[PDB]
């Protein structure tokens, strides 16, 4: 038996957690906080030549999603960086040098996707740390799989992370969930502990 | 008597529903998902010449809301397409051809509106399907009334929808809730079943 008052408090706490970027963890990869995509290696943007901007009927411009969007909070359907194939890369300079402890990856939920499936979602992926530049050899921090049957937002704690700190990390997508032309990345976050 | 654990679960489910575009239904009219406003017929935008952009005191540009905003998720006060009169039209090419089953219309809530009233909200409206182009004769899919005393977001299931599928639909606003100069449309969504 729970009182009305306890219900209120439980609701209050859940909404405060909801309002703290859903998961309550600072994101060192958030663009507005000072992070950016610095390279995509040889990732080939999947360009469809479909979203056409025009005025008085004059074709002006084809819009497509920048890699930058993976560090942007708006994750409505279609607001994702799409690359060709199931193999892609994004190198991110974090907003502060940290010891990384977890990353988060999300995708649009099935309920909002057509046919209720998300085969364009990343599946297996890995995270690498770069101690200085992005040309030296990456150190693997973790390998993980984004689960298409889990929550749209999934957090991934490194098992036995070292004490090394990094300001450059790379998200590598290895496979996807079956989509034959592309892979969509909605948002990638990186969490950890700053220099203390 | 409910346990703490059941409360948590109920809260969890309600927040997951909240996060799925509030109502948990894919929206085939969402612009970022591949839909667009293709015509407004003879709808006359209500232009006020009021929102003036300037630099070093130099008048540059009067901002006004595009029809496109009705397919955009941001619905803060004023982020609505306004037309003159209580009669207006918007033709939308959906992002996929579907059998339509429901539409949703929302407006700013009364609590956030001045005087706590929303007389600029649409009242009676109807939805038409176009089997191909937008010039042939529309087929009526439903007539409905947006209720000014209901929730800000209202979903409207068609009674006895046919099995016909469409990629072009038109929202027609017939009356409003009393506002003498214009009608504000915040967001219009269309739900249904894709080709299977």
């Amino acid at each position: 038996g729970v009182t009305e008052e306890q219900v209120h408090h439980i609701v209050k706490q859940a909404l405060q957690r909801y309002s703290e970027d859903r998961i309550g963890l600072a994101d060192y990869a958030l663009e507005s906080g000072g992070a950016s995509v610095i390279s995509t290696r040889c990732s080939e943007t999947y360009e469809t030549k479909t979203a056409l901007l025009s005025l008085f009927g004059i074709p002006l411009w084809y819009h497509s999603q920048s890699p930058r969007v993976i560090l942007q909070p708006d994750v409505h359907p279609g607001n994702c960086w799409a690359f060709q194939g199931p193999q892609g890369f994004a190198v991110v300079r974090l907003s502060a040098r940290i010891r990384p402890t977890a990353v988060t990856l999300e995708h649009v939920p099935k309920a909002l996707s057509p046919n209720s499936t998300i085969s364009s979602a990343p599946k297996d992926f890995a995270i690498f740390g770069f101690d200085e530049d992005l040309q030296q050899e990456g150190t693997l921090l973790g390998k993980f799989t984004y689960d298409q049957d889990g929550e749209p937002i999934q957090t991934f704690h490194f098992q036995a992370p070292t004490m090394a700190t990094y300001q450059v990390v790379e998200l590598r997508i290895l496979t996807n969930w079956g989509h034959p032309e592309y892979t969509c990345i909605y948002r990638f976050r990186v969490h950890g502990e700053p220099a203390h | 008597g409910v346990t703490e654990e059941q409360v948590h679960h109920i809260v969890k489910q309600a927040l997951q529903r909240y996060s799925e575009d509030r109502i948990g239904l894919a929206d085939y009219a969402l612009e970022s998902g591949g839909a667009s406003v293709i015509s407004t017929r003879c709808s006359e935008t209500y232009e006020t010449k009021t929102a003036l952009l300037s630099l070093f005191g130099i008048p540059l540009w009067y901002h006004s809301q595009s029809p496109r905003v009705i397919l955009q998720p941001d619905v803060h006060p004023g982020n609505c397409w306004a037309f003159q009169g209580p009669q207006g039209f918007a033709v939308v090419r959906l992002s996929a051809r579907i059998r339509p089953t429901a539409v949703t219309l929302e407006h700013v809530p009364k609590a956030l509106s001045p005087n706590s009233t929303i007389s600029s909200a649409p009242k009676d409206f109807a939805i038409f399907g176009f089997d191909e182009d937008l010039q042939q004769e529309g087929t009526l899919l439903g007539k409905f009334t947006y209720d000014q005393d209901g929730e800000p977001i209202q979903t409207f299931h068609f009674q006895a929808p046919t099995m016909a599928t469409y990629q072009v639909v038109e929202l027609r606003i017939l009356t409003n809730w009393g506002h003498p100069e214009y009608t504000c449309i915040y967001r219009f969504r269309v739900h249904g079943e894709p080709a299977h």
């Binding site: 005025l55 279609g78 | 406003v37």
Partner: peptide
Amino acid sequence: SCALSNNFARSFHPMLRYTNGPPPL
């Protein structure tokens, strides 16, 4: 006359159209 109109088409509001199928999502 009404049906033939498209004021959106004659404005300073850029129009968006999906000419070649859905965007990626």
